[PDB]
Structures are given as C-alpha cells and as structure tokens.
Design a protein around this ligand. Structure first.
Ligand code: ZN
Ligand code: ZN
Ligand code: ZN
Lengths: 272, 192, 195, 123, 93, 106, 71
RNA sequence: UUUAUCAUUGAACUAUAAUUGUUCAUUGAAGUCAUUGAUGCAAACUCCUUGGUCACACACACAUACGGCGCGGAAGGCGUG
RNA sequence: UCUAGAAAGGUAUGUCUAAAGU
C-alpha cells in the first residue's frame, strides 16, 4: 500500500481530524494535524501521491482561512508550493497573505521580496514591487531589513548610481531602529567621492551654490575646495543625524522598549 | 579508447558446449576474485580464464529457469577457499607483527624496570606505580594504537571516529574481500 | 596529467576520482580561498585614476579665481595617515560584513517559527543545508566543542511555551549609534529608569 | 578600425570581438580565450537580436533604424557548435608597446617566483 | 586529452550560481554541482525558464552537454589563474 | 589616579593579604589589592591587580617589585592601565522628582 | 572515454524531454558512454499514453534529465 | 493600437464539433508574473566613460585644385638589412 | 630454437609525536 491509503487507514488520523473538527479555533490541534500530514510524506517532491498533495493543500488553505493573521504559515505554504514546482501558485499565496494583512505586514513583504528577486527576472517590474512595499511598510520601525534589501538590488542591478543616492537620502530621514548603518553608508560614500562633478549626485547644483556657497564648476586648484566640500556636507549630515537620533532614541526609550511580543500567537493567548 | 564509438565497438564485440577451460566458471557463478582486485594494491595480475558477457547472461538464463551445474560451484569453492585461507594466513601474520612489536626487547626491559618499580598505603603506592605502568603500556599504545580489520587484514584504530572507518569500509579491497567471505560462508553452510 | 594552478602541485594521470578528491581537499580549499580573497582585495585596493588632460585656462577664469581667495589645505604626517587608513579599512570591512538581523530575534516564539527562520527546515533550501553539512571525518573536530547543538525540530507546535513573558524574555537591544558623533546625544533622558 | 591581415584568432586576445551565431544573435564582448573547437570565452558580452516585429524594416525596398534588445551577460563561455563568424569591433584598452612592457614584467615576476619557490624548498 | 581554457573555466565554477541557455531556447539557472569534460552539467535548485516564458522550479537537472548554447559563470573568475599568460610550472614529477 | 599594576605568575598559596602586604606599606600605602581567584574553584589564577593612589607610587612599586621573589616565584608586575563604529547609547538620570517618575499616577 | 555521472539517478523516476517537443517519464535503469538510456515503465507525459514494458532512448535526442524522485 | 484560459451540466440559446457563439452559476484539466504591462512611433532633459585638450600662428589660398616641408603618439599598408 | 626480472611515485585522509612565552 502507498503513502495515501496507508495514511488513511492509520488510527491517529481519525483522532487528529476529529479533534480539529470538534474544536476549530484552538490552534495546537491544527498544527498537530498539519505536522502529521507533512511527516506522513517523508520525501516531499514532485512525484509524491497527488491524492495526498491535494489534502496537504486543503489543510493549509483551510487553516489559513481560519487563522488569517498567521504570518509564518503563509511563507511556509508558499515555500511548499515553490518546492512542488510552480512559482505561479506561490505568487498567489504570498499575495493573499499580504491582502489579509491589508498590505501592512513587514515579514510578508520581506519574504515576498527575497522570493521575488529570484523569479521575476524583469527589472522595472521588480522595482515597482519594491516601490509598493515602500509605500505601505516603509516607515516601520524595524524595516532596516527591507531598505537594506532594496539597496542591495539597486547596487547590483543599476549602472547609473544615481538611484542609490536618491534612495539613501530617503533612508536618512526615516526614524529606523538601526539608522546608524544607513548613516555610515552615507558617510563612507561621501568620503569615497573623488571630484567636484559628483557632488551633484546628492542635491542639485543650485542648492549647493546657494545653501552651502559652493560652485561645482570652480576650475582651478580643486584639492582644498573638495576637502572644504566634504567637511560642509559632513556638517549637514551631522545635523540631520541629531534630528533622527533624537526621534529614534525618544521612541525607543519611551515606547518600543516595553513591547516584548510582536507576533499573532493564537486566539487563546492573553496579552500582558 | 579515444573515440567513443571505438569503446562502444569494444563492448558490443565482447557481447557478441559452454564448458571447458576457455571460460572462467568462477566469474560465471559471479564475482571472479581476479576481477574484483584488478586495479588495487592487492592486484593478482590478470584473470587467466577469459571473461565474456554472452556466456554470463546465458548462465543467468540457465540458473533462472533451466538448471545448475555443480562442477562450477566446486571449482569456484576451490578458488574461493584457497584465497580465503591464504588471507587468513596473512591476517595471522599481521597480528603476529603486532605481537612482535608488543614483545620487543628494549620495550620489555623498560616495562620490566617499571614493573620492578611497581613493587593499605603500600597498596596505594603500588597502585600509583601500576597506573604509571598502565600509562607506560598506553604510551607504547600511543606509539601505535593498531587493531586489525578482521576481514581484510589491514590495520585500523579506535581513536579514529566512525567516519574515517566508513571511509575504509567502502573500499575496493574490503568490499571485494567481504564478498569473498560471504560466498565462502554460503558455500560452507550449503555443502555441510 | 593534471596541475592544480592554485595549489602549484602536479598530479599523476588525470582520473576524475583523483581530481575530484583533490578539489575537496582541505589544503586546496585554503589555497583557493587565499587566492580569491587576495584578488578581490587587489581590485578593491587599486586606485587607478583618470589621466589628466590639462587645458590652458582662459583670461576671465584666471581673473575670477585669482580674485576669489586662497584656501588652506590640510595634510597629515606619515604615522597619522597610516593609522587613519587602518581605521578606514576595518570600518569598511565591518560595514560589508554586518547585516540587520532583528526580524529573526523578534519573532523568536511565534507559532510557525521553526518552519521559516530555522534555515534547515525551509522547504526551498531545506535539503541543501543537510546535504552540505560536510563529513567531519575528524573525531577531534566534534570533540573540540562542548556546548549544546539546540536543533529546533520542524514538528514543534503552539502548545509549548504558552505564555511568552513568564519564560524569561530579553528586552531588545538599544539602537546602535555612531561613535564619532556619540557626544551629540541628549545627555539626560526623560523618565527615571532603574537598572 | 583596421586589423592586421595576418592575424588569426590566437592573436586577437583582449580585442572586442562581435561573434555572430546560428540564430541571428550577436555577442559583443571582449575575447579572452578560445579552443580547438572554437568556443570562445567572452568577458562582458551583450547578446543582441533583431525582433520578429522589426525584421520587416530590414527587408529590401534618410536611413534605417533598428531597435535591438541588448541583454547583458557577464563572462559567458560559448559553445562552438553555434558560432557562424567572428568580426573584430574595438581595439584593446592597452597599446602594443604597453602590452610588451607588461608581458616582460609578468615573465620576470614568474621567474622570481619559481626561483624563490625552488630555493625555499631546498631550504 | 587536453581541454583548454573554456572547459577548464567551466570546471572552475563548480559550486556557484551559473545561468545557461540551451539550444532549444530554455534557460536554467542554479548552483552547478558537477560539470564534466564534454560541458555536460548538473544544476541544483534551479529556476527553469521554458522557451515561451513560463518559469517553473525543479530540484536537479542534467542537461546533455551537446545542447548548451552558453554558460554564464560569475564575474570574479576573470581573475582565475588559468588566464595568466606567462606561467612558470615548477617541475614534472 | 587609581593607578593599577597587574601582578602575575603568583604562587597558589599567596593571599590577597600577602599581595596587599607586599604592595602596601612598601613604597606606598596602596588603596587596594585583588588577586583573581577561580570563579567556581577558588584556586588563584596566578595573576591579580593592585590599585595605588598615586602614579609615582605605582611606578616606584613597578621598578622595585619586577622580578622580586614572592612566595617562591617572580611576580611580573607590569602596569594594567596607562575601534568599532557602533556603540550603545548611555545617558544620565533625571533625579526622580514627581514629574520624571514614570509610575507617578496621582 | 568518460561515463556520465548518473550514479545518483539510478533506479529512480525521471522526466526527460525527448527531442524538444515530446516528454517521457520512467524508472531509469541503465546508461552508457553516449547518453543513451534505458528506462523501465515509460509513460509519455502529454490523457497520456504508455509506451511499453521497456524502452531504450537513443541519447542523441535527450535534452534534459529532470529527476522527479528524491535522488 | 492590441490582448487576459477551456470543459460537463443546468435556465434560455444562434447552431456541421469536444452546446462552440450569449448572461449567470456548479463541477473539472493545468494555470510565470505582468495590463502603471506588451508592441509600434517620436522628441526633450539629465548623468557617465574615452583623448596631445601638444608646439608655432590670428595669417588671403587655389586647376596638375590646393608647399601632406613642426615635435610626437595610436592603428594599418609596403620595402630592405 | 633468438636469452621473461613490474615499477616507483602523486594527491586526498586521520592519528601519534613535538615545538612557545609575556
Ligand atoms: Zn575469472
Ligand atoms: Zn578492512
Ligand atoms: Zn590544489
């Protein structure tokens, strides 16, 4: 006998399924039923019994229709369908995961973008997905991982290196949990500049000429003037560092230090 | 060979009564011992009787449904028995070499001096000197620490993990000689 | 025959069973890792600057930049610039090596945690991590470390750790700040906090 | 550009070849290796093609402009069964005199390397 | 026999992400486990683009060597030692 | 200045009392003496610090106790004292009146 | 010359795309120096229709060898 | 400008088809994402990389059309030792 | 019938033995 019929005539399956079908909103019964069905196919691959894959899909889909705020199981169900051969279904699994969260979950956007980097293979479409994730879950206090992932894709694909300076200047004003890394990128990247024409990567040339009294087209000895330039831009970055440091340290000391639990858990849990 | 159709020609030509000295009957039963040890360092040379695949699959057909020729079994058992008894002599030689290391002269006089140094609180002094002599015997072991692989006869050790042992036990020598020991156990149970 | 270009050692008749056993040799792996670290270090460290094509400056440019003013240029001694370059190289390496990893520390008790963040039970890269664990045919390699392994199984459920606060939790670490601008912080907090 | 008349493919290393292939595609990349089977190793190649739609514009009857799909491929190796022709496009980054200086310097460094390796293994 | 710089370079990229397009039009891209002497490759954890675009996923694949059109190795193998023109091999055995 | 000297290679049966005795009342009156014992075993790790008030007192102790025989050994009296981007913040405390008390609910 | 390294794919199920268009699945049993392969219980994946009790594919027309089983 | 799966049936239904066409539903195969996409057409703006930014001069030449009569450098052609 | 002397290495691997203080 095969895996499916052997699984059905097992005694535990009727007990686990009757406990789930009696007590739906208790989570541990669902997870016991789910771990048993997955362990009952010990190699999972493309050739395992289709009457049993249909049942693993019905179990995951029905659990996630019961408990729609479970972040880790959307990732896991999508990665299971990604193992089973079709990325077309795993796109839909992540997207209903984002929609049940009304697009504002950080973990599903982070795992969906580290998924989508591999399989979308069209550059402007992948960047439209990063702009979507930015406008929903960008200002999250722990979204350092999203922005660092986004800067990784920008520095590996693009040849222009203007879009990196643009995106990094938007990181510099957001109060993130770990903004000092995104300041150290800006500091070493100012310090890694070489000549006066590249100061227009940051801001416009007239903004420099008015606000910082600095001419890009100053032709002459360009050693001391470039060092003066780097010191004045480092001073402006120090002031914007003070403002973001104040807002981050205020949010952390007062509010974000005290929350210990950020996850859905189960409908039977109590919050302190 | 160099072009792949040449090697393919070689294989099909060696694919295309059944008695006499021309055909190695030991290969015909299976696992000729001059075939299992061709390339290794226990190489016997070349198998004298030729090996051929048409004869072998005719034997597969014959022992599938037709009959069994027990002269082939007694010839294979003779060759198998002489090789297995020869390597039993060689593993006896290997453990003799361990003994001859163990009964070396200067080491025996050193352990004799330490064992004369082994001679209540008298028992505590004797046990401290005997643990020093146990560590002297273990220092002689730390020079070697050799056990003998009981099948192949080659050396082994226990300080070594299971994985480098698993590296040994999937050898050409050890798998070939395990196959020889297993056909010898089968034929000595079946003939008795 | 064969010749390991990285290793600088010849070999006898090139059989795939000899060659493949050389290519996962530990000493060959050290030599290859050194070679590629040094070549990436050389192409980072090589400042090739553009060649200078100096044109003859005009008159009105010469009057304007002769009538601006002259700026002082700062320069440092030899030991100063050597110490500064050692500091700059280690700071660029720790920015390249680090990574924000707070979404892993922050979901540490969640229900489906072992199926996503464990990295050995992941369905996409699940078989690869177990497959590439390596033989460890060295007894003393496992006999070196005497800590626990803490293999979190995939079969874990929601029932264990029912109350996350009572099992002793850790507060999240304060946000790291730049050490060179560490004096610009507000010197007093607002609320009296103890321990 | 003008290439020397007696210049086989062994001599055009570090030029920027333009390898045609069996499908209309073209791999504009810098050559750095080749083989008996003529399967090159192009350094920074850009696989172009003329689409099925704009191919009517090449059909025989201002100028004609064709919009090709540049698709960047980094350090390809080709399979030599596919190649159809190679055309040189651009000269190298270095001169000939500079390549002479650099080749003498590399051979000098290799001979010093083998000298130190020999005298270290004798010690 | 002798293999030369391209097939030897392909043997230098065992373990890393390669991207290869077959002659039928497909494009497979994964970690290259074992290549061979005749450019006969395997690929683990691949992302398989069918010719009309439908991307699927499959655990391992063994293409025939004869069907490959190109193989895109990583960038750093530009600095591989086999591209060095003036080499000084020490001594035969 | 709390000048600290790092004595080392000390004998096992040498106490912090004897380490005080060999450091205090000769060349100085040292403010502290502290040998590092084992945190669960109690047996001295063979090295320990002593804290003198004045830096001239410590260096006078340093030149004279270097190599000096203390309970069977030479006790190696080198001075104990005298580049990451990211550090955790640290802040003062607002001295706890009724406004700056986070539990004040009246 | 050189045998293909299919010692892992022995005695498992395998999906190979014959000649571009067609696609056959079966239980691999043997192979040779050219990549001609012999696979037990071949079913042409199209409503699919089965070939026969044993086949032997000439290895001129194999393009890829996907392994359906765990390997 | 142009596209966005078919079936079995029900209710009606033009109708050679595997009720195709038409609205609504069930069930069933597999099902890259994209429709702010794709294909065609045209312009504007911005930003990169590359070089003798050399020397002499601010000048009245030419039917055999034009002193190719400064120092170099890059690439090719041709001849000699 | 025309005089048979098989290698000697290479790489991979673990273990022993050992060399270091302030
Ligand atoms: Zn035989
Ligand atoms: Zn053995
Ligand atoms: Zn090597």
């Amino acid at each position: 006998m095969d895996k499916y019929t052997a699984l059905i005539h097992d005694e535990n399956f009727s007990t686990l399924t009757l406990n789930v079908s009696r007590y739906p909103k208790s989570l541990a019964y669902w997870e016991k039923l789910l771990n048993y069905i997955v362990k009952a196919s010990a190699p999972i691959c493309k050739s395992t019994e289709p009457q049993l894959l249909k049942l693993i899909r019905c179990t995951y889909s029905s659990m996630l229709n019961e408990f729609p705020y479970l972040e880790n199981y959307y990732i896991d169900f999508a990665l299971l369908e990604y193992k089973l051969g079709n990325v077309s279904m795993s796109h839909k699994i992540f997207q209903r995961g984002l929609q049940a969260f009304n697009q504002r979950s950080l973990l599903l956007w982070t795992s969906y973008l580290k998924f989508c980097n591999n399989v979308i293979s069209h550059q402007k479409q992948l960047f439209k997905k990063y702009e979507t994730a930015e406008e929903y879950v960008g200002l999250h206090f722990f979204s350092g991982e999203f922005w660092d992932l986004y800067l990784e894709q920008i520095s590996s694909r693009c040849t222009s290196s203007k879009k990196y300076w643009n995106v990094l200047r938007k990181i510099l004003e957001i109060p993130l949990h770990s903004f000092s890394k995104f300041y150290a990128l800006w500091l070493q990247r100012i310090d890694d500049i070489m000549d006066l024409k590249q100061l227009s990567q940051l801001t416009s040339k007239d903004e420099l000429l008015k606000k910082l009294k600095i001419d890009i087209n100053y032709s002459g000895r360009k050693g001391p003037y470039l060092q003066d330039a780097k010191k004045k831009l480092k001073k402006i970055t120090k002031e914007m560092y003070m403002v973001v440091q104040y807002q981050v340290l205020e949010i952390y000391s007062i509010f974000e230090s005290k929350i210990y639990i950020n996850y859905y858990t189960s409908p039977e849990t109590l919050v302190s | 060979m160099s072009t792949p159709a040449a090697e393919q020609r070689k294989l099909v030509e060696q694919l295309m009564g059944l008695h006499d000295p021309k055909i190695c009957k030991s290969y015909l039963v299976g696992e000729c011992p001059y075939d299992l040890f061709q390339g290794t360092k226990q190489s016997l040379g070349k198998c004298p009787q030729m090996h051929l695949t048409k004869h072998k699959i005719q034997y597969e057909r014959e022992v599938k449904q037709g009959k069994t020729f027990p002269e082939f079994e007694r010839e294979y058992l003779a060759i198998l028995s002489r090789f297995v008894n020869e390597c039993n002599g060689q593993i006896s030689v290997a453990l003799q070499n361990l003994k001859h290391t163990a009964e070396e002269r200067m080491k025996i006089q050193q352990v004799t001096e330490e064992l004369d140094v082994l001679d209540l609180i008298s028992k505590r002094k004797e046990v401290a000197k005997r643990v020093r002599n146990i560590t002297e015997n273990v220092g002689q072991s730390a020079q070697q620490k050799l056990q003998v692989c009981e099948v192949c006869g080659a050396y082994l050790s226990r300080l070594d993990t299971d994985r480098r042992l698993a590296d040994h036990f999937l050898g050409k020598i050890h798998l070939g000689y395990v196959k020889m020991r297993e056909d010898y156990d089968r034929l000595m149970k079946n003939n008795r | 025959r064969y010749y390991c270009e990285y290793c600088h050692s010849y070999l006898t008749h090139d059989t795939l069973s000899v060659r493949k056993s050389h290519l996962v040799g530990k000493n060959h792996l050290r030599i290859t890792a050194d070679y590629y670290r040094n070549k990436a270090r050389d192409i980072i460290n090589k400042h090739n600057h553009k060649r200078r094509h100096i044109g003859k400056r005009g008159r009105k440019e010469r009057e304007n930049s002769s009538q601006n003013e002259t700026l002082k240029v700062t320069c440092l001694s030899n030991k100063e610039k050597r110490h500064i370059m050692h500091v700059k190289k280690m700071n660029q390496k720790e920015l390249a090596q680090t990574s924000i990893d707070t979404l892993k520390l922050l979901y540490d008790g969640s229900p489906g945690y072992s199926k996503v963040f464990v990295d050995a039970n992941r369905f996409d890269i699940g078989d690869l991590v177990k497959a590439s664990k390596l033989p460890q045919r060295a007894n003393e390699k496992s006999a070196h470390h005497s800590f626990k392994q803490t293999s979190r199984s995939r079969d874990e459920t929601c029932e264990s750790n029912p109350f996350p606060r009572l099992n002793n939790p850790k507060k999240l670490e304060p946000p790291k700040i730049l050490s060179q601008w560490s004096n610009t912080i507000p010197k007093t907090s607002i609320f009296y906090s103890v321990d | 550009i003008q290439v020397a008349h007696s210049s086989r493919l062994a001599n055009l290393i570090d030029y920027k070849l333009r390898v045609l292939t069996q499908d209309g595609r073209v791999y504009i990349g810098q050559l750095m290796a080749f083989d008996k089977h003529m399967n090159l190793v192009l350094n920074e190649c850009i696989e172009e093609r003329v689409p099925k739609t704009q191919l009517d514009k090449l059909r025989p009857r201002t100028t004609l402009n064709i919009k090709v799909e540049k698709r960047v491929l980094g350090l390809t190796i080709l399979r030599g069964e596919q190649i159809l022709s190679t055309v040189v496009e651009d000269k190298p980054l270095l001169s000939k005199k500079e390549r002479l200086v650099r080749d003498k310097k590399e051979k000098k460094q290799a001979q010093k390397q083998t000298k130190l390796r020999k005298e270290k293994e004798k010690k | 026999t002798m293999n030369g710089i391209p097939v030897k370079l392909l043997n230098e990229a065992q373990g890393h992400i390669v991207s290869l397009e077959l002659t039928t039009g497909a494009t497979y891209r994964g970690k290259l486990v074992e290549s061979e002497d005749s450019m006969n490759v395997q690929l683990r954890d691949v992302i398989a683009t069918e010719p009309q675009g439908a991307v699927t996923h499959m655990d391992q694949i063994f293409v025939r060597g004869s069907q490959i059109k190109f193989i895109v190795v990583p960038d750093l193998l530009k600095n591989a030692p086999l591209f060095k023109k003036n080499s000084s091999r020490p001594m035969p055995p | 200045n709390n000048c600290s000297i790092f004595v080392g290679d000390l004998a096992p049966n040498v106490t912090e009392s004897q380490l005080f005795e060999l450091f205090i009342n000769r060349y100085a009156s040292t403010s502290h003496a502290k040998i590092v014992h084992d945190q669960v075993t109690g047996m001295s790790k063979g090295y320990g610090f002593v804290k003198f008030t004045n830096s001239d007192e410590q260096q006078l102790a340093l030149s004279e106790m270097q190599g000096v025989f203390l309970n069977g050994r030479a006790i190696k009296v080198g001075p104990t004292s005298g580049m990451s981007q990211f550090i955790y913040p640290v802040q003062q405390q607002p001295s706890l009146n009724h406004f700056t008390d986070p539990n004040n609910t009246t | 010359v050189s045998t293909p390294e299919l010692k892992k794919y022995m005695d498992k199920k395998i999906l190979l795309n014959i000649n571009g268009s067609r696609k056959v699945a079966g239980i691999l049993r043997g192979y040779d120096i050219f990549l001609n392969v012999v696979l037990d219980d071949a079913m042409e994946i199209n409503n699919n229709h089965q070939l026969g009790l044993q086949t032997v594919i000439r290895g001129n027309s194999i393009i890829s060898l996907e392994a359906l089983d765990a390997i």
